Amino acid sequence: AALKDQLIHNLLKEEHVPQNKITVVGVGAVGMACAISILMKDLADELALVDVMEDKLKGEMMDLQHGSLFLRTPKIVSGKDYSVTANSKLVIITAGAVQRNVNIFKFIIPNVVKYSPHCKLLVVSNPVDILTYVAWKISGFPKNRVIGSGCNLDSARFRYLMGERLGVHALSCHGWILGEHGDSSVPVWSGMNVAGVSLKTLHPELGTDADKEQWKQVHKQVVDSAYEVIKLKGYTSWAIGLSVADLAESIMKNLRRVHPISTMLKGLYGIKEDVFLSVPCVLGQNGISDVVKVTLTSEEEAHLKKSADTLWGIQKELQF
Amino acid sequence: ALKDQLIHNLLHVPQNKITVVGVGAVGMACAISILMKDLADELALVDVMEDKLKGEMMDLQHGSLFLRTPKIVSGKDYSVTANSKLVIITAGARQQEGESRLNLVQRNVNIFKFIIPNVVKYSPHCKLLVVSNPVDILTYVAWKISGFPKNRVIGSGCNLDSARFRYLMGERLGVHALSCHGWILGEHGDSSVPVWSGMNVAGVSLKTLHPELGTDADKEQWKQVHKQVVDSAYEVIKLKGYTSWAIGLSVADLAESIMKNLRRVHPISTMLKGLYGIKEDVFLSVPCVLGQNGISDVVKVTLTSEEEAHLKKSADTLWGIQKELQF
Amino acid sequence: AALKDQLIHNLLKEEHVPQNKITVVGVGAVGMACAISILMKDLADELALVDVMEDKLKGEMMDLQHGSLFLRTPKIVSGKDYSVTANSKLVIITAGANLVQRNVNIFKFIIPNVVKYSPHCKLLVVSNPVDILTYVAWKISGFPKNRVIGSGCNLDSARFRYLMGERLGVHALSCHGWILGEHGDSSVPVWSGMNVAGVSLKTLHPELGTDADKEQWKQVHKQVVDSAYEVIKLKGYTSWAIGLSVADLAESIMKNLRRVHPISTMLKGLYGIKEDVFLSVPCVLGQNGISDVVKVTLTSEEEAHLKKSADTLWGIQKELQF
Amino acid sequence: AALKDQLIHNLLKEEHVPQNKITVVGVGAVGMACAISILMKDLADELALVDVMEDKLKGEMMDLQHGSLFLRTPKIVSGKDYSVTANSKLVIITAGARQQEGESRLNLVQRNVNIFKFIIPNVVKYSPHCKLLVVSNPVDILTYVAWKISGFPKNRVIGSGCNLDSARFRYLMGERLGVHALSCHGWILGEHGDSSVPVWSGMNVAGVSLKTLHPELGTDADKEQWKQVHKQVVDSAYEVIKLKGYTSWAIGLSVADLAESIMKNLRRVHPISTMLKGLYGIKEDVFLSVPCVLGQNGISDVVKVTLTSEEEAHLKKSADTLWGIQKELQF
C-alpha cells in the first residue's frame, strides 16, 4: 500500500484540540517579531497567524514551518478566516492603520471572541491605551482578560539605559515607567534602585532639569526611542517582540510576575473613568489578577489623572 | 557621579563573540536566533548602510532585559568585529535581470575583496560561515581571499534544504521533522542531490520498504518532494518577497555546533578536493562533523553511480566559473 | 491594614485549576532526577510529588520550592494523599518495593489513586521490571493503551547512542541506533538501523553485530545491558540519565511533538505477538500518548527474540494476582 | 579496514584545548546538584567532576555521560587526579571534612582547612587562571582559606555566601504577597546562616519600599512577624535537613545562577561572599556577602548599600567573629 501504511501502524483517531495555542493577529514586522520570539521560547504547542494579505500571510507561515526542525512548536497554521485562531489561550492584536483603528477592531475582535471565547487579549497596536479600551469594550471580556502592551517595553528600555550608565546588566537595574504609553509616561524616580539601594537617596537631584548627569533625559530617550529607530531602519520589531513574548511567558506559565502593562484602572490611582494605563500588574493564566499600588507624589498622581482625562475625552467621541 | 556613589570599582577581550556581516532580512534572522539561543557573550553587526545598521543594533540593544548577550556593538568599520570566534557572511549582491552566473559571482567577489580581508585582520583565528548565495562558489571565494585553512571556511550549503526536506517528509508520514532522516547533498540549488538510500524513520530504510522511492514510476511522487525543496525559496519569495526565519534557525543551528564544539553532523559546504571523485578546489555539501575548529571530519556516504555523477558535473560547473574569476 | 492589602489591590478571585500539571510518584533518587529535569526544561506550570514517607516528601518539596527564583514552574506541591495529584496531564510512576507480586501489591494502591484524581492523564511507568509493571498499571487503570506508556528501552537506546558516538568521534545526536523489546538482558540491538547521516553501518561493515567482528560491536550492546549494573556497583544507584531520558518523553507528551521514541507499548497484534504484553518499539509520542507504532523490518533472529520475550513476560503475568 | 576509517574521513588532526570548562570538586549531593543544573543550562563545553571516593566518582560520571544525548556538553570527565581539571574557567569547590561525633566547631573548620590544603594547590596547578567559587561550609571562612592558599587576587575568589539565603528569602516574600520570587526583591547580607543581616530598607515589589508602606516591618512589635521571615531563611536548611537529611536542589540551582553570570559575562548583581577589607567599615581580611557585580573576571565591583547603624554593627560583629576564628587556623 502507501509508504505511510508500510512504515507506520495508526492506533488512534486524531482527537486534537490544542492545549497551549497562541494567535498573533497581523503579520507586520511587530507581529512576526512576537511570533519568532514566542516560537524560540517554547511557549506554545500551536501558533496561528491571521492577517488581511493572504500571500504575505502564507509566506510568513511557510518560512516559520521551514524552521520546524529547530523549534519545539509542532503545529504552525495561518488563514484569512479566524477559524484557524480557535482555542487560543492568548491572542496578541498587532494590526491597525484612530476611529479607523476602532473600525479595524470591529472586524478582528468579534471573530477572535467567537472562536476563542476564554482567551486573554494582548493589544500591542498603537495608540495602545485607547486600542486596549476598544478591544475591551467590543469583546465584552472582563478586564482581567484584556491586557495592553503599555509601558512594558518603555520600562525594559529604561532599564537598559540605566544599565549602560551604571555598567551592570539591565536585569539588576530596577525602574518603572507608568500611565499613558509615549510623551505623557511618568518615570517613578523614587522606585529606581540597584540591589534595593534608592538612586534618589544617593542623587537627590535625580529627576530634575538641574541634575548634572541629566537622568531626566534617560526618560526623554525612552519616549523618543521608537522615533529614533524608525528614523534609522523604518520601524521597530525586535525589542517589542522579546517584550511581548515576556508577557506571553507570564500568562502561559502562570508565573504571577509584575509587569508595567495597561489595565482597566477606574477605581484606583484616583481615576474615575473607564480608561487603561500602565501600573505594575500581577500577570498569570487568568491575565491581570492584582495591581501593585505604587506611592506617587501628587505631581505623579496629577500627571496620571491628566492622561486619564485626555483618554476619556477621545474615547467619548468614538462611535461603536 | 551616581555610578561612583552606588558602586565601588575593585578591578575587556570577549571569549564567545559572533559577528554577523550584513543586516539584510537574513543576517538579522541569524542575529535574533543567535541571541535567543545564548550562543554569544558578544554580538557585532557590520553593514555598509550606516543608518539601518545603527537602527537594527539599537532595536536589539533595547531587548537586552530579555536576553543573556550582555554586549551588542555595530559599525561600518570592521574593528567592531575584533576577536570573533565565528563570523557569518550574509552581505552580497542579488542577481539582476539578464545577468550571467559568472557576472553575479564576480560582483560578489568584488564585495568579498573588501569584507573578507577586513574580517581576517581583526579576527585572524575565527571560523567563517558563508550564507551568501550562490553559497558553494561564494564560500570558495571567501576561502581563497582569506587564505584560511579549509577546516575554518564553511558554507551553509544544504543545511536548510535537508531541514525543509525533513519537514516535508514529516508532514507526509505524520511524525515530527526531528524523527524524519533525509540528506540533500552536493550543490545548493536545482542540482541538489537527494540521497534516497539514507532516508529513514527509526533506522528503517524507506527506499528498501518502497523501492519506487526516487523514481518517476513511484505513485506517491516522492521525486516532487526533492522539487518542493528546490522550489522552497521561489515559493516563499513569491508570497512574502524574501526568506528569513528558516535560514536564521538553520544558521543558529550551525553556530551552536561550532560555539559549543558539539561535533554534530550537518550537511554543509566544505572544500572536498580528493573525495567523492572531485579533483579540483570546489565546495559541495557533504555530511560534515562541526566542532570548535569548524569542519574536522567528513562522513563518506555510499552514492549510486547516478549520484557521484551529479556531484562531478556540479564540481565541473563550479570550477568553470571559478577559473574565470578576477581576484 | 495588612501590608499585603497595602501593597496589592486584588482584582480577581480565581479558581486554582492547573493547566500543565505533572505528578512524579516516588521521591527516590530516580523520581527527584525526573523532578529536577522536568523543572529545568519548563514542561509544567505545577509539579506534584507523592510518596509514603511524609518527612522525605515535604523535605524534597521544600528543597525545590527554595529554587523557585531560578525556575519557571510557579507551583510545587506534595503529600501522602493523592488529592495533590488532581488534574495531572501526566503522572510518572517511579515507586516500587514474587518481587514482581510486591510491586503489584504497591501498584494496586498507587494506580487507582492516580485514576481517581486524574481520570484523563497519561501514565509513564519507570519502576522495574518496567515492561511487566507497565502491563500491571494498564490492567489496574482500565486506561486505553495509548495513555499507558513504559520508559522501556528509551534509556538503553540513549546509552547505545553515547557508546556509538564515543567509538566514531561524533555527538550522540548524530549517532542513530535502536534497542527494542524487553528492557535488560534480553533487549534487541537492531544492527540494520544503526547509521550516521543515513549510512547503514551494517551495510558498510557486514560483520557488524556478529561474533567474528574484530571491532566487537556486539560487546557494545552488552555494555548497554550491563550499564545500570556497573553504575549501581560504583555509586549505589542510577539517577541522572534515567531522569533526563524521562523528561525527554515528558517533553514529547506535554508539547505534542509526535517524535519517535523506543518506549514500551501494549503490542498485541503487532510484530507477530498474540498476548497482552508491553515491549519497546519506535512509538509516536504526543499529547494523547502513543498515537502510532513504527513497523521495523527485523531479521528472523530479531522477530524470534521479541516473540520469546512476549512468552516469558505473558508467563510471568499469568502467575500474578490482581 | 576499521569502521571509523570506512565511515569518516579525518581532515584535521584535533588536539582538544577546552574553551568553556567547569570543574565541580566534590560529588556529594551538593556537587551533583551543581553538576546537573550547570549541564541543564548549557554553560560548559567540558565538565570535570573530582573527589576522593574513586568508586562513587566514576559511577556519577557515567550516569551523566549516559544522558549525553539529552545534553549539549560533549565532554564529561572525572578522576581522583586533578590533571582532569586543567584549563577550567570556573572550579566550584563543594568538598569538606565528614562530621565526627563529639567534635568542636574549631576542629571541624581545621579539618576542612587541611582538606583545602590538598585541594586548592592541585586546582591552581592545572587551572591557574580559573575563578574559584567556594560552596563548602563554613563558606565565609573556607572562601578566605581558598583565597590565602591559592594566592589569587580577590576578584577571582567568590563564596556562595548569602546567595541562596536571598533566594530563600525571596521565595518566602513571594508566598506572603502571592507574587513570583522574580518580582519580590530583598537582600540578605554579611555572614551566611545564623548571623545573616536582612536589609529591610531594600525590600520591595515594583520599587515600592515595604519598610515605607509598613514601618514596623523588621521590628518585634509588627503583628505581621516579618522578622520571623528572616528566621524562616536562617532555619530553612535545618528543617529540610531534619526531613530529608540534607539540602541539594536549591543550592545547585543558586550555584548554577552564579556560574551563568561568570560564563556569559552578565555583570548581574548577586549577594555573594567577597573579601571586603576597605569596604563597609570592615578593617580585616574576611569574606562577607554584599551585592557583587559578577562577570568573566569574577567579582568586578561591589554595590555600597546604605545600612542602618545597627546593620553596620552586625557586619563589623561578624568581621570580628570571622577574623577571630581565622587567627587560630593552622595554614
mmCIF file with all atom_site columns, N, CA, C and O in Angstrom, chain C residues 93-120:
data_model
loop_
_atom_site.group_PDB
_atom_site.id
_atom_site.type_symbol
_atom_site.label_atom_id
_atom_site.label_alt_id
_atom_site.label_comp_id
_atom_site.label_asym_id
_atom_site.label_entity_id
_atom_site.label_seq_id
_atom_site.pdbx_PDB_ins_code
_atom_site.Cartn_x
_atom_site.Cartn_y
_atom_site.Cartn_z
_atom_site.occupancy
_atom_site.B_iso_or_equiv
_atom_site.pdbx_formal_charge
_atom_site.auth_seq_id
_atom_site.auth_comp_id
_atom_site.auth_asym_id
_atom_site.auth_atom_id
_atom_site.pdbx_PDB_model_num
ATOM 1   N N  . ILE C 1 93  ? 5.365   7.143   37.218 1.00 0.00 ? 93  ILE C N  1
ATOM 2   C CA . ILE C 1 93  ? 5.438   6.170   38.350 1.00 0.00 ? 93  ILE C CA 1
ATOM 3   C C  . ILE C 1 93  ? 6.880   5.707   38.514 1.00 0.00 ? 93  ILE C C  1
ATOM 4   O O  . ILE C 1 93  ? 7.355   4.978   37.645 1.00 0.00 ? 93  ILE C O  1
ATOM 5   N N  . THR C 1 94  ? 7.514   6.062   39.627 1.00 0.00 ? 94  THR C N  1
ATOM 6   C CA . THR C 1 94  ? 8.912   5.679   39.965 1.00 0.00 ? 94  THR C CA 1
ATOM 7   C C  . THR C 1 94  ? 8.946   4.794   41.234 1.00 0.00 ? 94  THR C C  1
ATOM 8   O O  . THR C 1 94  ? 10.036  4.284   41.545 1.00 0.00 ? 94  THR C O  1
ATOM 9   N N  . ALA C 1 95  ? 7.806   4.555   41.903 1.00 0.00 ? 95  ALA C N  1
ATOM 10  C CA . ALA C 1 95  ? 7.716   3.812   43.188 1.00 0.00 ? 95  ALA C CA 1
ATOM 11  C C  . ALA C 1 95  ? 7.624   2.303   42.955 1.00 0.00 ? 95  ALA C C  1
ATOM 12  O O  . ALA C 1 95  ? 7.044   1.895   41.942 1.00 0.00 ? 95  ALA C O  1
ATOM 13  N N  . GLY C 1 96  ? 8.128   1.529   43.922 1.00 0.00 ? 96  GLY C N  1
ATOM 14  C CA . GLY C 1 96  ? 8.087   0.054   43.962 1.00 0.00 ? 96  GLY C CA 1
ATOM 15  C C  . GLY C 1 96  ? 8.978   -0.486  45.070 1.00 0.00 ? 96  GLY C C  1
ATOM 16  O O  . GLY C 1 96  ? 9.876   0.260   45.515 1.00 0.00 ? 96  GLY C O  1
ATOM 17  N N  . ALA C 1 97  ? 8.765   -1.741  45.479 1.00 0.00 ? 97  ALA C N  1
ATOM 18  C CA . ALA C 1 97  ? 9.481   -2.439  46.580 1.00 0.00 ? 97  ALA C CA 1
ATOM 19  C C  . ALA C 1 97  ? 11.010  -2.382  46.399 1.00 0.00 ? 97  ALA C C  1
ATOM 20  O O  . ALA C 1 97  ? 11.513  -2.984  45.422 1.00 0.00 ? 97  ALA C O  1
ATOM 21  N N  . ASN C 1 98  ? 7.903   -13.157 42.549 1.00 0.00 ? 98  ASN C N  1
ATOM 22  C CA . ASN C 1 98  ? 7.288   -12.680 43.823 1.00 0.00 ? 98  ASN C CA 1
ATOM 23  C C  . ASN C 1 98  ? 7.679   -11.225 44.118 1.00 0.00 ? 98  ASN C C  1
ATOM 24  O O  . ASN C 1 98  ? 6.784   -10.458 44.565 1.00 0.00 ? 98  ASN C O  1
ATOM 25  N N  . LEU C 1 99  ? 8.964   -10.874 43.939 1.00 0.00 ? 99  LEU C N  1
ATOM 26  C CA . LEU C 1 99  ? 9.453   -9.465  43.867 1.00 0.00 ? 99  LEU C CA 1
ATOM 27  C C  . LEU C 1 99  ? 8.502   -8.679  42.942 1.00 0.00 ? 99  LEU C C  1
ATOM 28  O O  . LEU C 1 99  ? 8.133   -7.534  43.272 1.00 0.00 ? 99  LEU C O  1
ATOM 29  N N  . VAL C 1 100 ? 8.065   -9.301  41.850 1.00 0.00 ? 100 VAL C N  1
ATOM 30  C CA . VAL C 1 100 ? 7.038   -8.730  40.931 1.00 0.00 ? 100 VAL C CA 1
ATOM 31  C C  . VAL C 1 100 ? 5.746   -8.491  41.728 1.00 0.00 ? 100 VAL C C  1
ATOM 32  O O  . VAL C 1 100 ? 5.210   -7.360  41.667 1.00 0.00 ? 100 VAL C O  1
ATOM 33  N N  . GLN C 1 101 ? 5.273   -9.522  42.445 1.00 0.00 ? 101 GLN C N  1
ATOM 34  C CA . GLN C 1 101 ? 3.992   -9.522  43.213 1.00 0.00 ? 101 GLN C CA 1
ATOM 35  C C  . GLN C 1 101 ? 4.010   -8.377  44.238 1.00 0.00 ? 101 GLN C C  1
ATOM 36  O O  . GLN C 1 101 ? 2.945   -7.763  44.421 1.00 0.00 ? 101 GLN C O  1
ATOM 37  N N  . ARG C 1 102 ? 5.154   -8.090  44.870 1.00 0.00 ? 102 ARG C N  1
ATOM 38  C CA . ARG C 1 102 ? 5.265   -6.996  45.870 1.00 0.00 ? 102 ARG C CA 1
ATOM 39  C C  . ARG C 1 102 ? 5.106   -5.640  45.164 1.00 0.00 ? 102 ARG C C  1
ATOM 40  O O  . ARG C 1 102 ? 4.503   -4.731  45.777 1.00 0.00 ? 102 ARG C O  1
ATOM 41  N N  . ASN C 1 103 ? 5.621   -5.496  43.934 1.00 0.00 ? 103 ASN C N  1
ATOM 42  C CA . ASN C 1 103 ? 5.472   -4.249  43.135 1.00 0.00 ? 103 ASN C CA 1
ATOM 43  C C  . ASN C 1 103 ? 4.018   -4.160  42.640 1.00 0.00 ? 103 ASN C C  1
ATOM 44  O O  . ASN C 1 103 ? 3.486   -3.035  42.615 1.00 0.00 ? 103 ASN C O  1
ATOM 45  N N  . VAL C 1 104 ? 3.366   -5.284  42.320 1.00 0.00 ? 104 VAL C N  1
ATOM 46  C CA . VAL C 1 104 ? 1.897   -5.334  42.013 1.00 0.00 ? 104 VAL C CA 1
ATOM 47  C C  . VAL C 1 104 ? 1.079   -4.871  43.244 1.00 0.00 ? 104 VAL C C  1
ATOM 48  O O  . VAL C 1 104 ? 0.206   -3.967  43.092 1.00 0.00 ? 104 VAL C O  1
ATOM 49  N N  . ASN C 1 105 ? 1.332   -5.456  44.424 1.00 0.00 ? 105 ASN C N  1
ATOM 50  C CA . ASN C 1 105 ? 0.660   -5.090  45.702 1.00 0.00 ? 105 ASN C CA 1
ATOM 51  C C  . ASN C 1 105 ? 0.658   -3.557  45.820 1.00 0.00 ? 105 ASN C C  1
ATOM 52  O O  . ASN C 1 105 ? -0.426  -2.951  45.923 1.00 0.00 ? 105 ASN C O  1
ATOM 53  N N  . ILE C 1 106 ? 1.846   -2.964  45.734 1.00 0.00 ? 106 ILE C N  1
ATOM 54  C CA . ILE C 1 106 ? 2.086   -1.495  45.734 1.00 0.00 ? 106 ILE C CA 1
ATOM 55  C C  . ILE C 1 106 ? 1.263   -0.817  44.633 1.00 0.00 ? 106 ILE C C  1
ATOM 56  O O  . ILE C 1 106 ? 0.598   0.194   44.926 1.00 0.00 ? 106 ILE C O  1
ATOM 57  N N  . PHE C 1 107 ? 1.298   -1.324  43.403 1.00 0.00 ? 107 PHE C N  1
ATOM 58  C CA . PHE C 1 107 ? 0.626   -0.652  42.259 1.00 0.00 ? 107 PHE C CA 1
ATOM 59  C C  . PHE C 1 107 ? -0.887  -0.676  42.468 1.00 0.00 ? 107 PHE C C  1
ATOM 60  O O  . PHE C 1 107 ? -1.537  0.240   41.968 1.00 0.00 ? 107 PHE C O  1
ATOM 61  N N  . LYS C 1 108 ? -1.410  -1.678  43.180 1.00 0.00 ? 108 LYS C N  1
ATOM 62  C CA . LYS C 1 108 ? -2.871  -1.870  43.405 1.00 0.00 ? 108 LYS C CA 1
ATOM 63  C C  . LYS C 1 108 ? -3.427  -0.756  44.301 1.00 0.00 ? 108 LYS C C  1
ATOM 64  O O  . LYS C 1 108 ? -4.646  -0.516  44.224 1.00 0.00 ? 108 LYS C O  1
ATOM 65  N N  . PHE C 1 109 ? -2.575  -0.099  45.100 1.00 0.00 ? 109 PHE C N  1
ATOM 66  C CA . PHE C 1 109 ? -2.900  1.152   45.843 1.00 0.00 ? 109 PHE C CA 1
ATOM 67  C C  . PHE C 1 109 ? -2.633  2.384   44.963 1.00 0.00 ? 109 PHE C C  1
ATOM 68  O O  . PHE C 1 109 ? -3.540  3.210   44.795 1.00 0.00 ? 109 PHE C O  1
ATOM 69  N N  . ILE C 1 110 ? -1.409  2.514   44.437 1.00 0.00 ? 110 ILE C N  1
ATOM 70  C CA . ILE C 1 110 ? -0.920  3.744   43.743 1.00 0.00 ? 110 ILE C CA 1
ATOM 71  C C  . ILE C 1 110 ? -1.850  4.048   42.564 1.00 0.00 ? 110 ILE C C  1
ATOM 72  O O  . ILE C 1 110 ? -2.399  5.166   42.519 1.00 0.00 ? 110 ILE C O  1
ATOM 73  N N  . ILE C 1 111 ? -2.039  3.091   41.652 1.00 0.00 ? 111 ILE C N  1
ATOM 74  C CA . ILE C 1 111 ? -2.652  3.367   40.315 1.00 0.00 ? 111 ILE C CA 1
ATOM 75  C C  . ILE C 1 111 ? -4.120  3.773   40.475 1.00 0.00 ? 111 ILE C C  1
ATOM 76  O O  . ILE C 1 111 ? -4.546  4.748   39.876 1.00 0.00 ? 111 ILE C O  1
ATOM 77  N N  . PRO C 1 112 ? -4.970  3.072   41.257 1.00 0.00 ? 112 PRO C N  1
ATOM 78  C CA . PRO C 1 112 ? -6.336  3.549   41.477 1.00 0.00 ? 112 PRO C CA 1
ATOM 79  C C  . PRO C 1 112 ? -6.399  4.987   42.027 1.00 0.00 ? 112 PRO C C  1
ATOM 80  O O  . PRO C 1 112 ? -7.290  5.719   41.598 1.00 0.00 ? 112 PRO C O  1
ATOM 81  N N  . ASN C 1 113 ? -5.466  5.395   42.898 1.00 0.00 ? 113 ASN C N  1
ATOM 82  C CA . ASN C 1 113 ? -5.436  6.789   43.442 1.00 0.00 ? 113 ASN C CA 1
ATOM 83  C C  . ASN C 1 113 ? -5.115  7.777   42.308 1.00 0.00 ? 113 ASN C C  1
ATOM 84  O O  . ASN C 1 113 ? -5.853  8.768   42.165 1.00 0.00 ? 113 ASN C O  1
ATOM 85  N N  . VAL C 1 114 ? -4.091  7.508   41.498 1.00 0.00 ? 114 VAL C N  1
ATOM 86  C CA . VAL C 1 114 ? -3.778  8.326   40.292 1.00 0.00 ? 114 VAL C CA 1
ATOM 87  C C  . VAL C 1 114 ? -5.054  8.525   39.448 1.00 0.00 ? 114 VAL C C  1
ATOM 88  O O  . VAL C 1 114 ? -5.305  9.689   39.030 1.00 0.00 ? 114 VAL C O  1
ATOM 89  N N  . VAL C 1 115 ? -5.840  7.460   39.233 1.00 0.00 ? 115 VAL C N  1
ATOM 90  C CA . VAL C 1 115 ? -7.002  7.425   38.286 1.00 0.00 ? 115 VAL C CA 1
ATOM 91  C C  . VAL C 1 115 ? -8.173  8.226   38.857 1.00 0.00 ? 115 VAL C C  1
ATOM 92  O O  . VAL C 1 115 ? -8.908  8.839   38.044 1.00 0.00 ? 115 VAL C O  1
ATOM 93  N N  . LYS C 1 116 ? -8.355  8.199   40.182 1.00 0.00 ? 116 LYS C N  1
ATOM 94  C CA . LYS C 1 116 ? -9.452  8.922   40.880 1.00 0.00 ? 116 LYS C CA 1
ATOM 95  C C  . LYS C 1 116 ? -9.285  10.424  40.648 1.00 0.00 ? 116 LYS C C  1
ATOM 96  O O  . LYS C 1 116 ? -10.301 11.094  40.390 1.00 0.00 ? 116 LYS C O  1
ATOM 97  N N  . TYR C 1 117 ? -8.052  10.927  40.745 1.00 0.00 ? 117 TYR C N  1
ATOM 98  C CA . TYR C 1 117 ? -7.759  12.383  40.790 1.00 0.00 ? 117 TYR C CA 1
ATOM 99  C C  . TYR C 1 117 ? -7.352  12.913  39.411 1.00 0.00 ? 117 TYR C C  1
ATOM 100 O O  . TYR C 1 117 ? -7.422  14.137  39.220 1.00 0.00 ? 117 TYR C O  1
ATOM 101 N N  . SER C 1 118 ? -6.961  12.024  38.495 1.00 0.00 ? 118 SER C N  1
ATOM 102 C CA . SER C 1 118 ? -6.591  12.340  37.088 1.00 0.00 ? 118 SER C CA 1
ATOM 103 C C  . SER C 1 118 ? -7.173  11.278  36.153 1.00 0.00 ? 118 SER C C  1
ATOM 104 O O  . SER C 1 118 ? -6.431  10.516  35.540 1.00 0.00 ? 118 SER C O  1
ATOM 105 N N  . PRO C 1 119 ? -8.514  11.190  36.000 1.00 0.00 ? 119 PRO C N  1
ATOM 106 C CA . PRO C 1 119 ? -9.111  10.217  35.085 1.00 0.00 ? 119 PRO C CA 1
ATOM 107 C C  . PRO C 1 119 ? -8.619  10.348  33.629 1.00 0.00 ? 119 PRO C C  1
ATOM 108 O O  . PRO C 1 119 ? -8.701  9.365   32.905 1.00 0.00 ? 119 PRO C O  1
ATOM 109 N N  . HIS C 1 120 ? -8.094  11.511  33.234 1.00 0.00 ? 120 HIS C N  1
ATOM 110 C CA . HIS C 1 120 ? -7.765  11.811  31.817 1.00 0.00 ? 120 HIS C CA 1
ATOM 111 C C  . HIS C 1 120 ? -6.256  11.801  31.553 1.00 0.00 ? 120 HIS C C  1
ATOM 112 O O  . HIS C 1 120 ? -5.881  11.948  30.369 1.00 0.00 ? 120 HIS C O  1
#
